[PDB]
Amino acid sequence: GPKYTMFHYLRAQEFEHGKSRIALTNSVNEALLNPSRVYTFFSSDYVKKVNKATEAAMFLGWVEQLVYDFTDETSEVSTTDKIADITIIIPYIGPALNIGNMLYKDDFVGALIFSGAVILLEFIPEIAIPVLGTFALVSYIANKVLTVQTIDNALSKRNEKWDEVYKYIVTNWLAKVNTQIDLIRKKMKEALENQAEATKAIINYQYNQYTEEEKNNINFNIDDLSSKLNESINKAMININKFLNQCSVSYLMNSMIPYGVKRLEDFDASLKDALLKYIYDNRGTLIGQVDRLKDKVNNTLSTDIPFQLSKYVDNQRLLSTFTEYI
Amino acid sequence: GPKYTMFHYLRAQEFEHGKSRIALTNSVNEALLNPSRVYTFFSSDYVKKVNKATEAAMFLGWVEQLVYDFTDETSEVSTTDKIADITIIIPYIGPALNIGNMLYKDDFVGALIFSGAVILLEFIPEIAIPVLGTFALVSYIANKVLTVQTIDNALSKRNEKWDEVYKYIVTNWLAKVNTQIDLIRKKMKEALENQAEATKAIINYQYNQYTEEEKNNINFNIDDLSSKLNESINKAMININKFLNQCSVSYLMNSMIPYGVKRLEDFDASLKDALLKYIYDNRGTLIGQVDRLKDKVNNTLSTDIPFQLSKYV
């Protein structure tokens, strides 16, 4: 069961602008407990290479290593939506349990790998499809054209239904799911903007802690560093946006829509039963075309209506972007 | 919500040896519904390369490429204990939710990152710390040496509990945790040599789809392939085992010992609460020392017994 919120994680990355030997750490707990400690999701190698005290000579080579590595920490990323979350249950009293019996979970939106750290995303709750309803099939004893008409209208309304549900799903995906993803977009840029300012204030300390002659005999410039980090960040944000787009579309296509389709297929099946029962109960009235109708019903209600994203998006620009990731 | 077992995931990776061309798949569920499909955690690019219809001419190069690839898929494996598992709540009714209030989970032992899949591990449950509340404080009437005795005994008994609980935790971490982790090593290596069996089955199906004078012109020995990826498999197990070792030792150091330390401090607290009430029910009988006792009490019961790994290993 749940215990922390994101605040836990985010506070760990925060610091106030108050000068001290502030260092990057790989422990959320340690960051949260020492105000001169800041949590990084970068590799320990980068941590050891940033917390390090460095003589004024090798100082400008230190910085250059960092900026390459920083770029290499924020841009070298990987992704997948293939994740096995395995919980192993240790019997402390009994005999050992069979690995078959251990717990397995793979229902994840996707995962962003940073060499130093893995970011996983899951979404809840599953979308709620409004109840689809039951077509009232009106009988007209001894009236072929009119009973045929209720069959035909039943099948048309059914198609409309697939359209309504799809439309419903897309509008919520745009209005509720993508809006949340956008806030994640913003938080990830922010996390990065903040990791840049951590590494920055760690350096500015070292250089604003040197013999005033070295401070002039070392060409140094904040805007120089405070730019090679932003372009580094924007470069990194290209992959992150790509990932988040992939998550958005994957969620629409592999979670939301299939859930809606399952519903519409049930609807189809019980409408199919109703219509076949209807046909049998009017088979006198409908003589000459019972088999035609029986088949038109079966064929129709056994072929799914494919989902066409382009029906429901009138931005085109948005359409172009999302279509890539299918 | 529902919990599921590893069973199906393991089954997904299984195939019967026949004569049909099995195909690797990145879909667990597709493999489970199809005898001809076997789940793999290698890159999708591996899946594509192995599932490829290959001509007799290009055969050997394709096998050799796969061996290299197989070695990269299994050796070029990264690891970490830094995982941020974030559940995003979607508000279907109302305004957007601040990311700050989404859920955050990070109690994993470690993560094994292959080119085509991430494997997260977590261990449950906490170890039961044996009942510490064992002794009661006997009220001796007007016997100062013997009330001071019970108090010195209680204090000397907690030092004993701390030790015994450390020993108990390390004991159960060798006999129970390290045992279950050694079954992880087993099922992992065994999975790797099922991926090796899969790929061999696929490559051997391809060799045995050619003409007889063609197969004669191709220096292919199914045995030297077997050795070649066993080499790769044993190679992979170095970093897998280093991982599990780091896993094993982190759980001891980061979960078990800290838990025991908490339940132990709970004990210490409860013991003062009862030692002082014992002093208030032993009014004055101890005076001339009341200070001296409470000081050595608080010196002792407000300070954890340092845990030293070397001692218990």
Residue numbers in the entry:
A (entry chain B): 545 to 870
B (entry chain A): 545 to 857
Show sentences the authors wrote:
Botulinum neurotoxins (BoNTs), the most poisonous biological toxins for mammals, are speculated to exploit a similar mechanism to block neurotransmitter release at neuromuscular junctions that results in fatal botulism. A BoNT molecule consists of a light chain (LC) and a heavy chain (HC) that are linked by a disulfide bridge. LC is a zinc-dependent endopeptidase that is delivered into the cytosol where it degrades SNARE proteins to inhibit synaptic vesicle exocytosis. Membrane translocation of LC is mediated by HC, which can be subdivided into a translocation domain (HN) and a receptor-binding domain (HC).
To better understand how acidic pH triggers membrane insertion of tHNA, we crystallized tHNA at pH 5.1 and determined the structure at 2.7 Å resolution. Two molecules of tHNA form a homodimer in the asymmetric unit. However, we observed a major conformational change in a central helical bundle (residues E620–F667) of HN. At acidic pH, the αA protrudes outward to form the center of the β2/β3 hairpin. This leaves the hydrophobic groove exposed to solvent, thus helices αB and αC transform into the β4/β5 hairpin to partly shield the solvent-exposed surface. The low pH conformation is facilitated by several non-polar residues (V653, F658, and F667). These residues are solvent-exposed at neutral pH, but flip inward at acidic pH. Notably, the highly conserved Y636 that is important for stabilizing the local structure at neutral pH flips out to be solvent exposed at acidic pH. Specifically, the tHNA homodimer forms a two-side flattened β-barrel that is stabilized by swapping the β2/β3 hairpin between the two protomers, which forms an antiparallel β sheet with β1, β4, and β5. As a result, most of the exposed hydrophobic side-chains of the β-hairpins are buried within the tHNA homodimer in the crystal structure.
